[PDB]
Design a protein around this ligand. Structure first.
Ligand code: NAD
Ligand code: CA
Ligand code: CA
Lengths: 405, 145
């Protein structure tokens, strides 16, 4: 069974899950989130040129493709790309795998699969590797050769549209845009395929803050959230501060959650609201390209505050990695995301009462660091909190405030 | 200053963290206690507050010092307009609607400890229209209430 094929299958399911509302997916087309399909209108004449130019690029360049198939791979690559053909896209990757290109992290189980946005991300590698105790090493997708080769062919086809198409023809202009879109959809796909392989804690280099509308936001973060929920990834550690701010910290205290308060928020111009576009073009009509990163005075952290208040015992997830859910007889507690078999019990006097939920919430915060520390059963009854771990104890009672023992 | 009802809420919560009833909490636990009362200081703001209280290096905060701090961060934050602006940044046209798909993307991204099911539930139970659109101000309302 092919490694990259199983990755792609997982990505397909995530993409179809993100598309659950738009319902635009077919048997053949799976949409890349944030990367709309722009249909390609090409004659077979034009296609076979693209193919041969690509056949050429492979033929005489340093790579591991058998020269027999130089032309077959080209044809597959452009067809997969230009027809947005999901099956063929996977086939391409499978074939690269069959020539000895790995889509796995180079250091195996000691790889810290990590992510970047912006140009300075390489200078974070050394501070991060030296913070590790066990010889774990940071990898970026640029370090994995399968992704690197594919991204290479992908730049070729993108550039070929710049050279062989006169933009003064209306069609061939539209065409160059198509290539670009299809080209971007590839980069997205392969980004998710990389992200899907992440394990344990991971690093995201985003100096000066989280970026909305880019590859990490569109195709990598959703995949990381999936892996957290399967218990495969732990903490997503964002680094938004200069390298110097991470000195003399262990690996566990470097970076923070991208929904923590005080994380800055940059957005591509081409992802801003009309309201904010106008504002900026008023003062500077010319200094706003598509990729121009605009800092916004917004707190992404607010969304997590909302959830804190909307969902019972959410804060116990964020704070203590505990999942507390409605149960057959009251509340069940688990190690988030509730995936190991182990289960302890919270029983409440009045389980529907908000104030009683918060009381036991805050008691758990104050008394337990994690699941393992908790008694098999925790009661709150007539304003006493009790544990039951073969013996029963009432460790606190309320009389306008909380006293202990 | 604060309301007496707020001082009360703050006391009841604090007291659970004051684990031998001397009127102090651990400095390590400040963020936690503030957050559980609906205030969300940055790591910078937390450090500031700690330094002001911990010159002597015992690493504890009085209950009056804790009220000062809650009061301070309460002035800075309007929870309502912070939640609005967050969602508004994904509203291309600014009419107060985004696509359901766009709302699924935002919530899966900006939900640290959601399950996939809870996201499904959020979108299921939202009032999506024939365009496939959702009023996020209403969405927030429903999630809050
Ligand atoms: N290895 C690569 O060459 C490569 C390329 C793209 C994306 N990625 C993956 O994604 C992340 C870096 O990309 P990013 O966008 O998050 O960071 P970024 O903001 O630094 O953008 C990096 C590149 O992506 C382009 N880009 C960003 N958003 C785009 C969009 N919506 N449409 C078209 N092009 C867009 C930018 O123009 C730039 O060329 C990394 O985590 C990496 O794994 C890798
Ligand atoms: Ca002190
Ligand atoms: Ca809108």
């Amino acid at each position: 069974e092919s490694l990259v094929a199983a990755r792609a299958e997982k990505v397909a399911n995530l993409y179809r899950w993100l598309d659950t509302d738009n319902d635009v997916a077919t048997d053949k087309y799976v949409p890349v989130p944030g990367f709309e399909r722009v249909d390609v209108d090409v004659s077979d004449e034009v296609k076979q040129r693209m193919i041969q130019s690509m056949s050429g690029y492979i033929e005489h360049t340093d790579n591991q493709v058998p020269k027999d198939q130089a032309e077959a791979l080209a044809t597959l690559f452009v067809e997969s790309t230009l027809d947005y053909d999901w099956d063929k896209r996977v086939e391409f990757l499978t074939k690269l795998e069959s020539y000895g290109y790995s889509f796995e992290a180079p250091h195996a189980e000691k790889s810290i699969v990590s992510f970047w946005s912006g140009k300075n991300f390489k200078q974070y590698r050394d501070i991060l590797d030296n913070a590790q105790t066990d010889g774990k090493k940071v990898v970026y997708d640029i370090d994995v050769k399968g992704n690197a080769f594919a991204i290479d062919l992908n730049k070729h086809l993108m550039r070929w549209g710049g050279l062989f198409l006169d933009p003064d023809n209306a069609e061939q202009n539209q065409l160059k845009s198509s290539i670009d879109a299809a080209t971007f959809s590839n980069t997205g796909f392969w980004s998710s395929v990389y992200a899907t392989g992440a394990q344990n804690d991971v690093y995201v280099i985003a100096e000066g803050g989280v970026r909305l509308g880019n590859y990490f936001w569109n195709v990598q973060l959703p995949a990381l959230r999936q892996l957290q929920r399967e218990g495969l990834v732990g903490e997503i550690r964002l680094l938004d501060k200069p390298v110097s701010e991470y000195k003399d910290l262990p690996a566990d205290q470097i970076g923070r959650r991208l929904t923590d308060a005080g994380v800055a928020v940059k957005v591509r111009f081409d992802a801003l609201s009309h309201e904010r576009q106008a504002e900026l073009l008023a003062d500077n009509p010319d200094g706003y390209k598509a990729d121009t990163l605009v800092e916004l005075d917004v707190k992404l952290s607010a969304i997590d505050s909302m959830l804190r208040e909307s969902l019972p015992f959410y804060s116990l997830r964020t704070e203590r990695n505990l999942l507390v859910q409605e149960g057959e007889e009251g509340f069940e507690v688990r190690s988030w995301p509730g995936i190991d078999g182990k289960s302890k019990t919270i029983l409440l006097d009045n389980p529907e009462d908000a104030a009683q939920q918060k009381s036991i919430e805050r008691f758990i915060l104050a008394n337990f660091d994690n699941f393992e520390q908790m008694p098999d059963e925790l009661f709150l009854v007539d304003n006493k909190v009790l544990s039951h771990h073969d013996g029963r104890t009432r460790i606190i009672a309320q009389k306008e405030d909380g006293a202990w023992t | 200053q604060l309301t007496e009802e707020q001082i009360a809420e703050f006391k009841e919560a604090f007291s659970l963290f004051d684990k031998d009833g001397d009127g102090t909490i651990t400095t390590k636990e400040l963020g936690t206690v503030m957050r559980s009362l609906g205030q969300n200081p940055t790591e910078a703001e937390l450090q500031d507050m700690i330094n002001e209280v911990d010159a002597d290096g015992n690493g504890t905060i009085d209950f009056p010092e804790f009220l000062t701090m809650m009061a301070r961060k309460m002035k800075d934050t309007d929870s309502e307009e912070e939640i609005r602006e967050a969602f508004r940044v994904f509203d291309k046209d600014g009419n107060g609607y985004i696509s359901a798909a766009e709302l699924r993307h935002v919530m899966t991204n900006l939900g640290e400890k959601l399950t996939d099911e809870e996201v499904d539930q959020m979108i299921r139970e939202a009032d999506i229209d024939g365009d496939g659109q959702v009023n996020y101000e209403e969405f927030v309302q429903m999630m809050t209430a």
